[PDB]
Each structure stands twice: as C-alpha cells, then as structure tokens.
Amino acid sequence: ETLVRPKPLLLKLLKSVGAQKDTYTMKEVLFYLGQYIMTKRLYDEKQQHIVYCSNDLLGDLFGVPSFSVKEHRKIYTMIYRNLVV
C-alpha cells in the first residue's frame, strides 16, 4: 500500500510498542501509534478525542502540547512530517 519509513523519533516511539521494523504501511503506523496512546492513557477521560502530550515524546514528535483526534487534516499532517516515502 503506502510504504513509509518512520523518522528517528517516530521509529523510537514505534519500537516502544513492539513494532520492530524500518518500513511500514500507513495502517501499521496508525495502529501502533494508537496503541501507544491508548496504553499510556494519554487521552482525556471524559472527552476521549483530546490527547495530551506535553510531558511526552509524542509531543516532541508532533511538536504540540495537545491535539484533537477529530481534526483529521491536522493529525495526518503531523504524522506525515515524521515519515519519508
């Protein structure tokens, strides 16, 4: 499908959740990236679409304190800035 290669920070985030590799389809990236968030309970408990990452590598990565998963163009863009291919 869309085979991407994650940048250094993102690859580290990925390994953190078991993804042991250098090349991924867009789907694997999102899957693990979602597993990281769910696992480290980084979402707001009441408004689950709010994710907090100020205190997190995810924030270093996306370069923002928090974000709304409901803003597809934003999420997709931030994620793309960290990929190649």
């Binding site: 499908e1 869309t2 389809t25 867009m26 789907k27 999102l30 979602g34 968030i37 769910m38 979402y43 689950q48 679409h49 994710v51 998963v69 409901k70 597809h72 999420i75 997709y76």
Partner: peptide, 13 residues
C-alpha cells in the same frame, strides 16, 4: 465516543 472509535476514523493511507 471513545478514543479507539475516534482514532480508527483517520486516513489509513
């Protein structure tokens, strides 16, 4: 609306 529901609606490619 839970996180997992929301997150799966992201562009998969």
């Amino acid at each position: 609306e839970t996180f997992s529901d929301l997150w799966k609606l992201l562009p998969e490619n």
